[PDB]
């Protein structure tokens, strides 16, 4: 009757879709040209950040 209780929530997140960051990926293909990172490498950075 004095002990406070503890409820646990849970969400599961994942690296964004290839079409969600297609505006941001086109920004990195214009300013960098041929040395731009791949879109499968721009997803491990945005979930690394």
């Amino acid at each position: 009757a004095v002990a406070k209780e503890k409820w646990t929530s849970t969400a599961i997140i994942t690296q964004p879709d290839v079409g969600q960051i297609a505006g941001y990926n086109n920004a990195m293909n214009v300013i960098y040209g041929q040395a731009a990172p791949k879109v499968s490498d721009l997803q491990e950075t945005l979930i690394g950040r």
């Binding site: 879709d17 079409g19 297609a22 086109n26």
Partner: protein, 48 residues
């Protein structure tokens, strides 16, 4: 079980037709722009 397989399959299939429509309608915007900046270059050559 055959309902819960089709339940996840109708969640993935609707999270990809929604994803492709946000990639095509944005992919034809970075091409309608890239035909406008490639046409002003083609008039800097014409003005020369």
């Amino acid at each position: 079980l055959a309902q819960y397989i089709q339940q996840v399959d109708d969640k993935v299939n609707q999270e990809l037709e929604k994803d492709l429509k946000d990639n095509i309608a944005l992919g034809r915007k970075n091409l309608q722009d890239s035909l406008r900046t490639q046409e002003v270059v083609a008039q800097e050559q014409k003005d020369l």
